[PDB]
Amino acid sequence: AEIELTIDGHKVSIEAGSALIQACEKAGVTVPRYCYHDKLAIAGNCRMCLVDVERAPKPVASCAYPVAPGMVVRTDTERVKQARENVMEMMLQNHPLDCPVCDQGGECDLQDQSMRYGRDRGRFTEITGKRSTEDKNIGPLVKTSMNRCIHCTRCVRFANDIAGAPELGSSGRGNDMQIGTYLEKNLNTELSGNVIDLCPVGALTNKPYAFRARPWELKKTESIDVMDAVGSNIRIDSKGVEVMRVIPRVHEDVNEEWINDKSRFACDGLKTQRLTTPLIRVGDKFVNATWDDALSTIAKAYQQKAPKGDEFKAVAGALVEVESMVALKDMTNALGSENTTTDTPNGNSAPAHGITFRSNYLFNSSIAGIEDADAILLVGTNPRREAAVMNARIRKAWLRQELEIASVGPTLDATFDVAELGNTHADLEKALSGEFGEVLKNAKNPLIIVGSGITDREDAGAFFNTIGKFVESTPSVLNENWNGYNVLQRSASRAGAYDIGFTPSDEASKTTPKMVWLLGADEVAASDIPADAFVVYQGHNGDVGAQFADVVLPGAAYTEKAGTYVNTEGRSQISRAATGPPGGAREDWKILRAVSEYLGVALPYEDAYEVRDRLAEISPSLVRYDLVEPTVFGDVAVQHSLVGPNGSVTPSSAPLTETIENFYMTDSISRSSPTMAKSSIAFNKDNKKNQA
Amino acid sequence: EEKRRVVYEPLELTQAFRNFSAGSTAWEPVGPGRDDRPDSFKLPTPK
Amino acid sequence: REIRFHLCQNGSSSAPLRQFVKNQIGAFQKANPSTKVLVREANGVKPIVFARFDHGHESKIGLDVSSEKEVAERVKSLIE
Amino acid sequence: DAYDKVDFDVPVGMNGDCYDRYLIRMAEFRQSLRIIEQCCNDMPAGAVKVEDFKINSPPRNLMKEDMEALIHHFLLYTKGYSVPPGETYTAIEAPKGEMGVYVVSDGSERPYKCKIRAPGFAHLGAFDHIARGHFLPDAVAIIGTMDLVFGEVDR
Amino acid sequence: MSQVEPGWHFWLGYGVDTAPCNTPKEKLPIRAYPYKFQPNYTGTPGAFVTYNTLKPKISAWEPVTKQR
Amino acid sequence: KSIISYNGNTIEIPEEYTKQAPNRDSTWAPAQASKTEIYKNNMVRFEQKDLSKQPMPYAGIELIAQQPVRFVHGNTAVCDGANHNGPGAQGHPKIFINVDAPGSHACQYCGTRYEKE
Amino acid sequence: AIIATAFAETVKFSGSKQELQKRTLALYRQFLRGAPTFADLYEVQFSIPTIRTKIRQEFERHRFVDDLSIQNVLYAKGHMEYQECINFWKQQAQFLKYFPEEDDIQGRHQPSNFVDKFLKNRA
Amino acid sequence: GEHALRRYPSGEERCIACKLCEAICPALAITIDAEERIDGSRRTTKYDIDMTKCIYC
């Protein structure tokens, strides 16, 4: 079923029917290109992958020539070496003289490409000159100078097929061809900024990071995205103090070399509103103070209030470290109170399902299994919003194979074709027994997918009890080699927190605390906090969580520390620190160590490796990094998820409203960054953001 | 000053050193290149 | 107070513990509704129970042990 | 460098003394002036840099006019020009002596290594084989005719 | 030294034949602003002082409390 | 004029030097660092020193705004900024400007704005 | 350059651990004999037995190396530093590298616990 | 000898931050940060030569 051929003497075998350029990549003979891409449709617009083929009258493009057996591929024919210089020279007679103002200085693929294979001179010295192109306003996210564009089609095929915003397009013939809406209307898909990593010239580039640095100055650091349930494998570009930008480093499973929009532009809030020193409340006024004085005030007011048990509330947030929450849980339960609750509304109890049986809070199919998916249904979520990388996988599957999606709850605009069913758990229960009890029994590799917003609803448990019956009832959705129950989170950390055992007891859910511990956790209200409560915030920037506080503690953000994160898939991933904590911020668990020391609590560690062993004690799957194991406990896990909230939850007719208010305003950084404020204003039902 | 002599203290810079070889192509863009081996001293082909 | 234990998802030397959590959780959770269990696995471990008490102080035992009731002997020993 | 194409006598001493090492230096003025006489008469016309724009800069006349000259002008001043791997030892006749250089190319654009053979390095190294027995004012006339400028020897 | 005008300072060190009183006005660089001629003030309290032109990299957070 | 020297003490420089420029008082960059921040940073090495004989270098954003916006008969303009007296290659390189949109268009090197008419 | 300097030896590599041990023992005797010369020559502030108790503890640092030839490079470096100190070749600024701890008692708040590391985020 | 930044006719700063001067100053005397200003054109925020180490290449 495979084909062996010869590229430059190198024999190489590749699967039949594939493209020749992948065979050149497999053989190790580097062939330059401009408009081939792996994850995209193939168009031969670039003319760069010209290559000599025995039994061919003319040299042909290697991107779209299909693999045939008995093939002799030559790349160094003098005709081909002529041809590459030719095509480069043809490309470089309307591209404008913008190399010192173009953003991709060292990263111009065209440019490095034109050093190997370019001509010495360029005989453009015509009088009346090149063409020139309109400014083409698009949005506040994507800087646009269409003069530098070469119509390499790589933007528009992506936003067409995978991003699913078909507003981009090619309009006009010859040099009157342009790219984009000639309405001059606003583009938005929920992964909008992914085109500026994709246009190989600086036609489309980064608007907030417009000219601030330049890719030879940069220090690069491979790390993990947060404020996203997938925890995409990213790269931090940093000058050394600030954080310049983020670019998705390639990874096969988790992101297929794509990244969320909010994940992209989040570096603005990472440098503008940060906590740089500890501030103690005077009474309607904070003053900054000695780093001893803050923690000594913590110990002093602990001796004043004395929470002896079930009065030390400890709440963590959305982008918080697993390694920090270990220190948190250790401190609280050596303190003698498991008032250990999430930030979410209806987080003050257990989240209506098992903290046991990791399957209860994880994504049990593979994300790679979504290529093999058949017919699924969302409940109570917008997966276009929550984990837009997942939506990219959904649309790629739906275009590739033949699928069926249902959507129960909020009416969303997908890129793909949804099928709505209702806005009631009774409408849901009607739909399960209506027609898809037959379909999901029929389907080979389906799944069923649940957003985390239903955890907000107090009627979650019966909301589980229906669906927990159905997985139990249908053996097709619950077989050995995968499990159809699949849940997501809004964070990169509440999955890791549910690995920690970050849940209050039924007893701990009752008492109003006296000493509230904020660790991130922006979305608390004045209702969630007691009146006289000791409310020491530990975070990185200034949000609502820092506004209620008594003492704030500058902790490092996700960039500055050696983080450890768990996605909804369950991948334990290292976040390599790109820079040091700025000002007077420190790392979080190191702060909790000293906070223990000014109490009677003795944490048994002082290093990072001893934390790694303590973390191995909580779960050894979190020191064994980034390797996804399945669960051998499917049926017992679903049954134990059924038995707990069985019956006692009485589901009301509350409509399944939207989980989040806006996408680009959450998680204390989209509110910190001014670029997401101006992103938020431009993105609701505007005449440039409307369709018709 | 106080030891009235020079002392050897560990390194502190005003400006951190910045190389710029991080911007670098992996494959060396020079080609394979022809040979100048003598026709005596390369291996004769069989037949 | 809490308790956890860890298996390896390969079927070797955690299989009596594996069937122990296949069966005995519906009785053990009802036997101790105050404290809390949780299960995790890491592709090869030694099967091991870690429990935390009413101090934050914890205790441990390693479960190279024969059957489900032989697990339960060590578990009941480890609670007290 | 067309020292072939320029007629040039060379002086050669007789004893091993410092006086031949003096007289040869006096002679090389007379020789290197004759160089200038045969150079200024026969300076040709032609391109003063190398012909291509791929190892040095294009002239600034046409880089503001041509698209191709900019990318060379940029890559030569950000990356630089790429060198084939290998190693060379090129040594030429400095007026101090044979000055050599041994460069080891990565194939990158930084030299992976580059030794100098400063000429006065071995001259200083050959001091106490020559300087034995002589006097201390005689230990000054030996110094500046092996030409220890000391910018050379250490580096 | 450096109490002389630049377009003369060239000619004092023999840069030009034609001193700037005799140059054509086409070679005068046209300027849209007046000229001041600070010669040098080294050691004088009019000495140049340096500073970084830009602000600190990361702005702090202003304390805004919230009475619950 | 009087700005707080981190201690409640005020430092007092004349309004001729609370200026970004002799042409402009206001900042023009996101990280411009106004002089009111700068004397607030290090007046330590500014005492006993003259205020007059520092640069004040006549910032460009005022000077470019009063240049006349040129007109172009056809469609595509060309900008060089090069003199026609100087025997050489000066000015910014020969980039072209599309002027079609309503409003002028600055040549991104020289800042001269062109208009199609 | 036929001839060497006064104390310089031709470097030669002992085939056995015992012959290396013999050379190191003779070497420590050479340091210990030349130690009162050093306080005169480098004009140092302090006393001769402080020099001797450093020269002892520096060999105590490398008492527990297994290999023959790593002790061979170690012996050669020791012999070269002997060669430097026996002449005027080091100067007293470079000679007082070997006592950072003696000349100044360190200063206030030498960090010992976690907390003193933490309050200056490990210095 | 010493340095200066030219300006355009009708007085505009003439320096864009191409960073070539940062890229090939072999003593790294050049240090530049630069931001997009109000009108949108690129200009240099801080341009700084360390004239201790300007080697007159």
Ligand code: SF4
């Ligand atoms: S994309 Fe920009 S930087 Fe690259 S060659 Fe073109 S103008 Fe120059």
Ligand code: SF4
């Ligand atoms: S918009 Fe950019 S990526 Fe798309 S074809 Fe044009 S230049 Fe290429």
Ligand code: SF4
């Ligand atoms: S910043 Fe760039 S354009 Fe400006 S002077 Fe320096 S090298 Fe030239």
Ligand code: FES
């Ligand atoms: S990708 Fe092969 S021709 Fe465009």
Ligand SMILES: [Zn+2]
């Ligand atoms: Zn211009």
